[model samples]
Target: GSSGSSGDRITRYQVVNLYVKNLDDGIDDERLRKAFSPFGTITSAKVMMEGGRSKGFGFVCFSSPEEATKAVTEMNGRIVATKPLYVALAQRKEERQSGPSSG
Candidate 1:
């Protein structure tokens, strides 16, 4: 059986994935990296697009959990581009594949 202690770890994330929103129409991965790189080393950053148009949202990943935490604490709910940034630890694959959520 998986022990309770199995959950123990130094951090709750494999990578600090952040979700941001309200981006300017033209925002891109390069721009996001420049914006978020100040908080930490961004492993990957990209603005989600649909039908060749901006989705007004994006994801940013940090190398370490601590840096990711700092990024969220300092950047979350703040204005970036022309709208407020909705930053957070990026969701895991299971969470993403799950059914409907209240949020």
Candidate 2:
């Protein structure tokens, strides 16, 4: 029982966070921004990298759910570096605890 128990902040829908995939190396934040910029204003854009090189994936954060939805619909499954981009609501990790009682 804590203040962070999957409480009032659960935004299971209308999320502004986006997961982009199949970006390929050499893709930078500016490039990523271009992809979603038309949809709406973005708060953050990042391209994950390994060894200082792009990891072919990135994220775009928007303040408006409407913008996020637009990006997802238009960008998802779109070709990028010979592969379709995977756009989805970003899934954040969390710690889960359960009760134990068998008596």
Candidate 3:
């Protein structure tokens, strides 16, 4: 018997990736995902970990920038779990500045 091998790769662009901070220790990736779910179709959401515990910060990536911006506007200072949430755009390591374009 022989099996055919096939491979494919897909790259997803982060239209609106968010950085979160001031999370309570009790929070986790699941909570972070749920918190941002209401705002958009979340591509990914995760809380930074430190020794199996929360690092008090996280990331939430939305498929659309509008939704991400809305989340930032609404949840930036909203209280959740224990502390006021700090939601903003995640700083890009590459830091490429590009002109806006939509079709």
Candidate 4:
């Protein structure tokens, strides 16, 4: 059975906002999957490991909004590996873009 109504007006899944910080120097997908497995099945987990290391932040996607909401509530401000975690509704990319950069 489907969890929610199946109509074009509504979506079956929701995009979650997960902010992970204070990561070790060599965190990887396996680590991320382990961290979020408790909440729900993670559709995707991207740890923005720039320069081949943790950027001190990352994002995770859940299959349903319920799972996403649960993650935010339970994971927000929680500590992971001695570092405080910060979780919220993932913001739209347009909201994070700057008009231009100055050199």
Candidate 5:
């Protein structure tokens, strides 16, 4: 499932995108989830795997938007397991698009 932001106010919940680069080759979903578990109750977690291996990035869903925001603020650019993590509020496809397309 995808999460969408509403208006200018932050939504009650948000999906945090963790852009993890320089990751160890074997890092998996379970390992990634375990790494961030101390932050909050993770609603969902997954590592973007390709060819049955992690793609050096992943996502974690927090129960509340506040938690997600806090996580991003506190964890962004932090080195995790020798890899620097870039955290941001995840956006849905609709959120990324502007207005209506003329196609």
Candidate 6:
């Protein structure tokens, strides 16, 4: 049992993170990283997965909020891998639940 892992560090502020939905199955960590890299330096990029299947969504973390904002503005609704990208700022699930649904 390993107590620590390699390439691990404190997670950065969430302000620079983007939540991307409607990702095609073809998209993976490297593809996601490549897509967002043009906008700015990416801290990390990953498509959420479960049991070896894609969750149809992913996260792309930029080096700064400015880069994230630009990525969202340019990539949101942009077609890729036969799916329209849904890009937005990442929000904590706890805070996200505070707003009532169907408003």
Query: Which stretches in model 1 have alpha-carbon errors above 4 Å?
Result: 1-15, 94-103
Candidate 3, which segments miss by more than 4 Å at Cα?
1-15, 94-103
State candidate 4's TM-score.
0.65
Q: On residues 21-79, what C-alpha lDDT tens digit does candidate 2 reach at each position?
A: 88856557787888789888999888777657777778889988877877897888777
Index of the highest-lDDT prediction: 6
lDDT (CA) per prediction = 0.74, 0.77, 0.80, 0.68, 0.64, 0.81
Q: How do the residues 1-103 of candidate 3 rate in per-residue lDDT, one tens digit apiece?
A: 9999776432335548888999899877888788888988998787767667777988888888878878987899898777789987875733456645754
Model 1 TM-score (2 dp): 0.68
Model 4 Cα lDDT, one tens digit per residue, 1-103: 6587555552434566565656665556678667787998887787776566677777787787777777777777777567656677765632364435553
lDDT tens digits, residues 9-101, model 6? 535565887889998888877888898989999987878787488889888888888778889978998897797889988766322434345
Model 1 scores worst on lDDT over the 10 consecutive residues at: 93-102
Model 1, 1-103: lDDT tens per residue?
Answer: 6655455344664657787777777667687778888989977777877657888888788888788878786877677556777776667622354445554
> Candidate 2 lDDT (Cα, whole model)?
0.77
Model 1 residue 64 distance off true place after TM-score fit, in angstroms: 0.5
Model 5 regions lying over 4 Å from their true place: 1-23, 93-103
Model 5 clashing residue pairs (backbone): 13-65
Query: Would you give me the overall lDDT of model 6?
Result: 0.81
lDDT of 5 by residue, 1-103 (tens): 9999668565553455444344566667787677667777787787666656767767777776666677776777777566566666666522243445454
